Amino acid sequence: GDINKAMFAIVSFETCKADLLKEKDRYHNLNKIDWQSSAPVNEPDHATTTPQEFQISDPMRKRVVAYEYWGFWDIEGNGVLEPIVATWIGSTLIRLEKNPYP
Amino acid sequence: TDSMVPLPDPSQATKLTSWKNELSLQALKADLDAAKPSHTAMMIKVK
Amino acid sequence: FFWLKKAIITARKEQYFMPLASVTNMPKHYGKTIKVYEYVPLLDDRNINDQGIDASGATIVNGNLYGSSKDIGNITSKLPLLTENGGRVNRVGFTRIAREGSIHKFGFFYEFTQESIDFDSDDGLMEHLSRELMNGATQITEAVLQKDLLAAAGTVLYAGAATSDATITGEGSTPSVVSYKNLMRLDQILTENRTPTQTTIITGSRMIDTKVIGATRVMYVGSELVPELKAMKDLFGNKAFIETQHYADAGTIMNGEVGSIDKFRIIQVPEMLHWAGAGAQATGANPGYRTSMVSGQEHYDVYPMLVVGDDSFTSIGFQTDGKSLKFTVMTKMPGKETADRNDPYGETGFSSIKWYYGILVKRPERLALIKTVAPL
């Protein structure tokens, strides 16, 4: 019954390759991604207002569903829980680091 | 090409970072599938 | 009755051949067919030309100096030699080949009604219907690709003494079952075809009870073949199957990998397809191998064990630019809008999904396969 006690949270949103390339330093493994496999219609879990027949021709401007994981993990195995963030598309982990916000 | 996906649902360490213990994609997906049944039941009431 | 409001849902079956294939774009307004050029080397048998002159100076039938043959006799006979006052002695020519592919259509739909969905005892029926629709579509696409790959195999080897699908049998002196020598032969052929090695060897770790693996290729097998692979023994009588636990540490285990044998790393595919009834007729002396009944007669079953090399094929993609296909899904919530010859009121909706499929094979020589029968 309290948000602060929650271990983790997961949000699924739509992004394009341009958004990922805005900060190329942060992300990794952008090459080995199946952009078409993770299309909005191919993922019925995500609920959105985009019409079911819509795909921009430009590869950079196509929008695909991505997941994030904001939670606590024992990074060092010493028994301490520290905040982390993780992002994955399809079956590939593209970003992994600690919580950036203060 | 380059064979198939090199890890069983990225089990073990993908080695993105230098941490001694790394999360791997399987654990995260497993927590997601664990949590999903309750959220699906809850969204029916909102609908 | 007190409904628990939490239904039981199955998960989507994982797909292996969708992420493997590479996809080529294909603009519209421009046909449905893609073509390529192959440039054959100078010293090849496929280089059949007519511009040939030998060291003597007369016209010779074969322009290529000598074919793929590696005899000392042929090489010595057809060496390009040059005299002091050389001129118009040796000529060579070249050739190019073309390959093509095409695109085909697909699709299916379903129906429902306002009353059935709306006034149902369980809410959330529409989301479930959409879920099974998408899962069925993905599974169908996967099966079609796998069927095409098995059909278009270039190097086909028959286990045992058989020479075709029909003569494969499980009764007699030589049952048609995979053995160590067949795996060695397939490795030799794939090395001859200059097929690149997918994986790297594994050097052991420092922990106790750890074995080294020197396999460089990946093999896809069904579930029915794995016990037969496990029982198999090498030339000297020891066990050939080395399970993943031995070399798991200090190595990378691919998903769905049961173990490693010889040069190959065996990957288990749940959805692998098998020919039914292709074998010879099965009598009462059957030692326990799987059979299927066709036209009143028992017949044995044939199992693929496919191997797919790097850059063997590309999938023609119509407006995809990426792995897998693009599905077009349409939904119309029911109402009075629909009209018909005798059904102008309308209370039914639907949801239809369609896609365009095509494949192009660039180097069939790299695809390989071993046909065999599988124990029950």
Curated annotation (Swiss-Prot), chain B:
Name of the protein described by the UniProt record: Probable portal protein
Annotated organism of origin: Enterobacteria phage N4 (Bacteriophage N4)
Subunit structure: Homododecamer.
Cellular localization per UniProt: Virion
Stated role: Forms the portal vertex of the capsid. This portal plays critical roles in head assembly, genome packaging, neck/tail attachment, and genome ejection. The portal protein multimerizes as a single ring-shaped homododecamer arranged around a central channel.
Transmembrane segments: none
Swiss-Prot record, chain C:
Keyword Transcription regulation: no
Pfam families attached to this UniProt entry: Phage_capsid_4
GO CC annotation, single: viral capsid
Keyword Transcription annotated: no
Main location: virion
Entry keyword set: Capsid protein, Virion
Localization in the cell: Virion
Protein role: Assembles, to form an icosahedral capsid with a T=9 symmetry, about 60 nm in diameter, and consisting of 535 capsid proteins.
NCBIfam families: capsid_maj_N4
Identification of the protein by name: Major capsid protein
Record organism: Enterobacteria phage N4 (Bacteriophage N4)
Chain's gene name: 56
